[PDB]
Amino acid sequence: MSYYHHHHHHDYDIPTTFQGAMGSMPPRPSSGELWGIHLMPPRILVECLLPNGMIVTLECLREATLITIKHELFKEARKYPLHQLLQDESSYIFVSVTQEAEREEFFDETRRLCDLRLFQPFLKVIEPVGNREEKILNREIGFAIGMPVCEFDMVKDPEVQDFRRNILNVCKEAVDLRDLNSPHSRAMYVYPPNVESSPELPKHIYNKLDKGQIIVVIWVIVSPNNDKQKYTLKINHDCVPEQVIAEAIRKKTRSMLLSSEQLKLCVLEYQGKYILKVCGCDEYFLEKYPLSQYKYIRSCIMLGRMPNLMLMAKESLYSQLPMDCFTMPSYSGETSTKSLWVINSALRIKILCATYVNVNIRDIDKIYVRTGIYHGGEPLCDNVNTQRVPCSNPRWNEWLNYDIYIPDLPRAARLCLSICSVEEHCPLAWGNINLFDYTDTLVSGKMALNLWPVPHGLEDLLNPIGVTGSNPNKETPCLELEFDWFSSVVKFPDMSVIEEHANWSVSREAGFSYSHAGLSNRLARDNELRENDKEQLKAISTRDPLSEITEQEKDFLWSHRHYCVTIPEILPKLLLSVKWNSRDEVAQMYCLVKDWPPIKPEQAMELLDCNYPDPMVRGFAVRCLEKYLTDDKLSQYLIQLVQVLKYEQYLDNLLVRFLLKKALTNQRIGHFFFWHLKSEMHNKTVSQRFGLLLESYCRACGMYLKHLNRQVEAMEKLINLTDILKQEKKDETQKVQMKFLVEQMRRPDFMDALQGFLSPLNPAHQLGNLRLEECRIMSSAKRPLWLNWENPDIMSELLFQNNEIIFKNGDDLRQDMLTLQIIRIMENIWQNQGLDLRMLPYGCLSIGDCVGLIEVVRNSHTIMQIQCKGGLKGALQFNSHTLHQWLKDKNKGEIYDAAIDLFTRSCAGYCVATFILGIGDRHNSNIMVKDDGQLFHIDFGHFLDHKKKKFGKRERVPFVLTQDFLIVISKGAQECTKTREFERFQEMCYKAYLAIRQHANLFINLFSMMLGSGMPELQSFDDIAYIRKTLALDKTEQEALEYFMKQMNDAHHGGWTTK
Amino acid sequence: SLQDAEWYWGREEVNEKLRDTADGTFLVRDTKMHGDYTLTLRKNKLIKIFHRKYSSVVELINHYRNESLAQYNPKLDVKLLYPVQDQVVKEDNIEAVGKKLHEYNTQFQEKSREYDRLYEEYTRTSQEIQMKRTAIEAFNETIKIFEEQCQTQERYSKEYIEKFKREGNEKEIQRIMHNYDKLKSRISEIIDSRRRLEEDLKKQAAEYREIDKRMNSIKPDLIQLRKTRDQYLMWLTQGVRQKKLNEWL
């Protein structure tokens, strides 16, 4: 007791006191097959309501089809009365109330009772009501989306209905590209060519080619199927599929009964009939790119593999393509107005009352409404109201007066308000509104605003980055209010009007005279500027987004705005230097942006974050994408572009139309476009928006809807199974759990639902039959499922006979998702700029609320295992060499030398990325090494040093190289730190660090665009400021290098020299 | 004095000191081949100080503590009003200020878990509530289909009583009335299922309010507990000991 000074804690108790003890797995909840029960009983009674009014309950097996149930119902209805009042069973269809509270008519009678999502186990019989049975396969769409389509139809809002009708413009326009040169262009939508951005090849790839040649293998089939024939080529790396197809045919059809010329004529008739498949997955080579430019080839080179392609007949392909067959749905500014520039008054806003406010009167003294106008940043002095009727029934009936003229409101203006407590200053709730509506109409009259709760990381009072609009959830502070009505609906000026007032503002400046102190605004330079300024302006240009601009530099920029056209890349900085509270300036800015030079997408993506909310700007930004952003480079950045939709003011905008169209032009984009939208559907910030967009996609995507509907059904199966495992089958043995898993998966509803479908991680890979013996639950507390499928390709053997991917209910995958994305982008940055560090950014996909998929990498082990398996007899200590010993056991000969090179190449890459991103501390169980010698990290945790939110200038080193790694880096030598093996390794790290330092603008912007997603690690820009220190962007590169050397020296305690 | 200067500290760590101060609060910062010093006035407005005059750095700032910045540059109608080691129990101990930093940081970190716990309960409860609301619309819809059924059978059954009648007058109509009796007390069960949900909904929304209520009482303490813990860490760094800190924290 003398340990604790006998000081008791009376409050503490252990009669079940928390989710600390056995602490994992918090995603709950979501209900399964029936209301209030995850998995319906294996034999169940179901009420069958008939047309004659008779209720017969008949026991069904849970897995029984509706054809089985109807057939039995109309046998069992004979024994009940009024049998002559029934028609033949064929004159009838089932219907019932589902868990979504809609009465879903059950048209596909092959479906099983468990799969219907029934709420209460009962069925009603009726004759099929709507003459278009076809039209009521919006069930397909609403199953894919997860909310029923009818739910939109009874939305009142004119914008939503205007989105739904107008967006079809895009859908029809996409389908019209698909069926243009059909069947080729259809095959192109379905199987778009999987191709790198560059035809140009890295020198280290080129040097594996012996003067630009690869050995390929073309495979063919003849009779009946199943017997296959190699035809090993040795073609040029930069020859096209058509040329490779000829050679395979040439060599297939040379012969002793065929002259040279006779062969040439047999080649021409045969050559055009085929196209190249990748053996083992639905990938193809459908247009003229260099073979090397297709991803599969370029990877086959890197891994030291011989590409295995198949010669596929075009008609056996145009067999497997369907008709995409678009169909318009059922659902197929009125009068003149007073321009905003006429309104001669200030802005004022009447704050009436908040109703549902939950505060302790014993704790809090007084509460008030803070307010402010914004554009990302604020166009005036931020004001409050008085601290009236504190806590109890808070009612202020005040007009707040904002020092801004109504004409000087920008198109993208937004009121950001918040109820606060009292220096005891402290926000309760918040909510923002666009001061104009989607039809450009200045908002007047009465408005009710249901508010949002303050999130974790926000200490600030107001939160203007937060989503524009009322909360859907009713039971929350409903602060209602009134806007000044000016005897006419006030609309925003036309562009033709802004052009004229701008062209006037210019010529008015031309007569402003000799001396103008605070020159800042205007140049006084004429057509001839000074060389020192034109040098300073490019210096500003180069500075990253987060290097905030001074009021001097702003004005300096805004004056020379017309020279700023010669340096397009300045535009982000220029725009932030406009006075948006001066329409004179904003009108002129609209004229520059109108015909500003297009810029590179990686620079134009800055213009779609929350600091650039203006339509004209964001237009130019999408104009940049429409020109440059390739279908490859788009899907690289798709996660960031979907997130950036949140910062658009209105549903209907140019960016949504861009992405939607692309997704309908390319099914590989479509596939991930669906899943990132679908992922966030649980979040009420965007449920409405993303549903609408997902409706548009689903209605226009052709037969992939039916593929997605299988994927979706397979995930929902797994979401239940795990949700049962994590609730009722916790406090059981693995033994007991696994016996439950295998039972369930063998039932026919699971066997139907989890077998023939496409991997959401990569829909190229098919998933065939489940191999249940290699299926299992992992040891993690979250109860992830290790799942395994037979690759049902013709050429399984050539690629992988078994696909296998981990499904993890209860862990938020989107942090990992993003870092693995950043790693993939760092790798391309290094490698395409000629230096071969090898990251393994394994696949990860979040498909819902803390539910997702992780690519298994076969033949890789945690350092911990390496050491567990290599631990000697009596448990004394683990050897540092055992990693090295284990790696040698796998690689012997010249193979050993190359394995170390790889290990050292992968160790240098992952050290620099890890340090830069500040990911979670690395250790034995989250670092992995492969049999061939490549190393890579898993389970990243928190990216931008989220553990610095407690205490935190820590500039942490997460990958700290114990001796283990250095032994392996420098073969076997005592005092590893001092070999040339390690000198090299260091110079890999320095060249790597400087590469990511010269692409810092990108990585800033990627993180800037991800603020939208409510990731606790990305709450606001100074989260992303960590990446500045770690990269050292305020310093010169020579100091930066030394900074990194310094940073690395102290973590490793010696070993980092001048060089 | 010019090195001390109170407000003179000598980008990222500037924002965290300007974070959650009022309109008018400021400080001065230090590439040299760029400019010299940087006034960071919050309204975060950065204003350059060029040196070739600035007569001194302290000269320029005391003028604008009295007077606004509107006459210098049009849209800066705000003064240098708040020129932000005061309390911290005035402990000139060094070690004992360091122990207090652990004490408050354990209390802060304790408090952030309680705040994080309740933000999950809140959002689970907002989910669980609306799941119940939809279920009630499902029940209410379920009930319409059963209320329609007991109606639907009366139309057809009371046609099949009057026509004929004598043909199994009770043999027919018993087993028609039995079905009708099962139908209506089934409705009685469904309704009593629904009623019982709505009582839970109000008991849930009650707890929902009680979570939010205690979130708003944990917040203001969490802000000041953090703010006191930062000045306790400022006071220390005014001996360097950047590395010694971590065991307390």
Ligand SMILES: COc1ccc(N)cc1F
């Ligand atoms: C077309 O095959 C199907 C696949 C999955 C479901 N649910 C229904 C089907 F008819």
